[PDB]
Design a protein around this nucleic acid. Structure first.
Length: 53
DNA sequence: GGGTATTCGCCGCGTACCTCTCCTAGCCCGCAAGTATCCTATTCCTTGCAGCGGT
């Protein structure tokens, strides 16, 4: 609601594997810009196109 | 005023030696030591509805 222009998904390790895997795969293919994420992305996930945290 | 009486408060009460115990209460502040929520692995199982042989 704050930013209607953005496409938002949710990614964390406490949801089912077939869902988190597909969500992360979609994020690679630019299917959405913002990804509300937990600290699971603190370990060195590259995703070069992402340049604002 | 004053001579008298009455009260009040201060000062004082032996030497020498031996044994023993015990010498502030409480607060604060920082050390440090022991605890409730968040992700990625693990062992723990108990239901719901469609196929499906088989007759």
């Amino acid at each position: 609601e704050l930013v209607p222009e953005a496409r938002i998904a949710i990614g964390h390790g406490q949801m089912r594997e077939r869902e988190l895997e597909r969500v992360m795969n979609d994020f690679h293919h630019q299917r959405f810009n913002v990804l509300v994420c937990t600290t699971i992305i603190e370990t060195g996930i590259d995703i070069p196109t992402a340049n604002t945290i």
